[PDB]
């Protein structure tokens with residue numbers, strides 16, 4: 001069972017996260033946590049039980065919170081699935097989510113092969 005050093009796991013996975021952040025405009029609604037109070041959407045946490053966003057993923061990747069690569073992958077998919085569950089299919093958020101998911105799959109596949 002391969003053990004992962006925290007800084008090596010971060011270096012391996014960081015380019016996949018940077019690829020998401022580089023999408024403009026598609027990363028913009030994902031760069032900060034959904035704040036239902038600021039946005040006036042009190043139903044949000046009734047639907048999204050486990051919020052996730054790029055800034056939280058980055059913080060976790062920077063602070064040794066992912067012991068194995070699949071935990072990072074799970075958080076990326078959680079972010080996407082939250083947005084695809086809460087938002088209209090033709091909404092900006094949903095369409096932007098789909099672009100990020102396209103980019104992510106391209107980026108994570110060879111990385112996971114090299115890790116393993």
Ligand SMILES: COc1cc(C(C)=O)ccc1N
Pocket residue numbers: 029030034039041082083086087093
């Ligand atoms: C309230 O609409 C939003 C929903 C979302 C997500 C990610 O679901 C993000 C930013 C918004 N402004």
